[PDB]
Design a protein around this nucleic acid. Sequence first.
RNA 1: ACGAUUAUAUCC
RNA 2: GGAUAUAAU
Length: 620
Amino acid sequence: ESETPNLDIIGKRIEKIKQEHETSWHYDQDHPYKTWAYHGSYETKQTGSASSMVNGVVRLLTKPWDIIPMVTQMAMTDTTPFGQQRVFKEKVDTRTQEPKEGTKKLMKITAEWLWKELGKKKTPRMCTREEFTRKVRSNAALGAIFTDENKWKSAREAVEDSGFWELVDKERNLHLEGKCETCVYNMMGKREKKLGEFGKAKGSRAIWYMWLGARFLEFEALGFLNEDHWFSRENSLSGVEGEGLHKLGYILRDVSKKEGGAMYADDTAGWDTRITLEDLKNEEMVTNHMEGEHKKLAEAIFKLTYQNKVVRVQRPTPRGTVMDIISRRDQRGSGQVVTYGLNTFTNMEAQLIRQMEGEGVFKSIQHLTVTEEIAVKNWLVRVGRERLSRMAISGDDCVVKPLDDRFASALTALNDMGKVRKDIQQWEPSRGWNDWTQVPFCSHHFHELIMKDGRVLVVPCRNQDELIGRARISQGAGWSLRETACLGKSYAQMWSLMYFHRRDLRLAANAICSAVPSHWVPTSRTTWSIHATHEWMTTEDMLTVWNRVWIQENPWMEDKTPVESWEEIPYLGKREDQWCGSLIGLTSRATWAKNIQTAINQVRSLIGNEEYTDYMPSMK
RNA sequence: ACGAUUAUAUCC
RNA sequence: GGAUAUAAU
Ligand SMILES: [Zn+2]
Ligand SMILES: [Zn+2]
């Protein structure tokens, strides 16, 4: 299970790091790395956090959930080097057994077919520095590894300096030689909100980012997959790139119209970690569709920086905090320019193969019969593009409506490819949904909503406890009321646009809007401006948003007749609202709703003497 | 100091 | 077009 570094590929980098840190370079033999080649360590200062901050306005306005642990245990993640290392031991420090011969044959035939179909109406191309210069956020991370690279205070200042692009040229000229001297990953813990356990916040995932020079070189050679929308639903059939979250239910309802079995949406456990060097090499086949200088640069990124990664990660130790130089050949580095696009690719390929195994196209990994190989190639030819349309795929999240239900029990290939399902035994047959409105996708399910007009909407919907929990906490420490009042309204605005159809969220949302100064306009998470005459985001121009998104711009809404009142906008049926976590019918909820003006007036008085508006007469 | 890819709102 | 905020992979 040990990792075999190629020191002819990653060797010059590890050395350059060493040289810049000679006063501290040691070789800890207490290093915990069981499946990653460890190369050294040196001293460094801890970054990260594990605190969470209370949004007082929302917590005061959501009292019935105080008693609900699925709300109240929500916290920010632990991104300290402790939190990272736990995540590392649990998820990133693992090995996937190389797939069997049959599997590798299935994967290559399917990868090669896929790129030819993705390339029928697109052509790979280099991206431009001007293109990079316009896209990059101005405060995106510099991520400098070497001292030659730590000259700028922002990415904007950097891409407007000749000396930045001189560095980029030095590595660019190496890449065209087949060598790499400077592309090293940084590491951090994903800052997000997770349910805690036993009074401890938990880390979530790893985030790997190279420096801004390297990130351009990625973008130069592979950005075209994103910039030219290769994984659009139009181009790839299976993808859903570019569609927002509210529109995804419409994409699912269509998929459901196909004749087939149940609808399956099995999560893969730690997808990025389970990406194998075979995967990494099937993904590289896109270079077969490239040319000239472009082909060399794309090969350089793939072999020297994706299939040969030098990662630089923090580990707590008794003698302060240290920084390990570790290296892995396989795995997707979360934060590579190709993360979203190439997870969609490989997942498309995976599910297809799983579709094939259910249909009988091949009977066993380890061995692909000369005859069977012909049947696979002819199955893609015959039905492959249709099989792709039976799927909705967003990176590793996927929904597959297969031909029959033998899909559920077709798992030899999926497991051998390393794509182990989460929360189910390796060979436990799969759970499948016969009602598309209950299929999870991009952390939601989707309800068909009949309007008072008779028109139908499809709307996103999740367990309420999940949404209230997240509105009630925030980045930071301690408690806050004024500093996160506009943040509460932001959440309220989201509840009214996406989840207007949950009684509790629309009530809570009008409450938060009523309790927050109406003339305050957010300038950051914790700062704002005050306009003397204008209110911000009134219940009327909230309704303008609801129309603009759900009627005017909704391509599944042929009748563009607006709604004139918030009372026109319907709700889910009570039993469904209840099923999806609503508190109606509980006694705590009734009291909360009756005395809601009393709690609004508390928050008002706690905030101070500002200007307020009642958003509640939208529900009478 | 603050990844890539993306949707939406808002402010300019 | 940018920034801010939220959300998704
Ligand atoms: Zn390089
Ligand atoms: Zn629901």
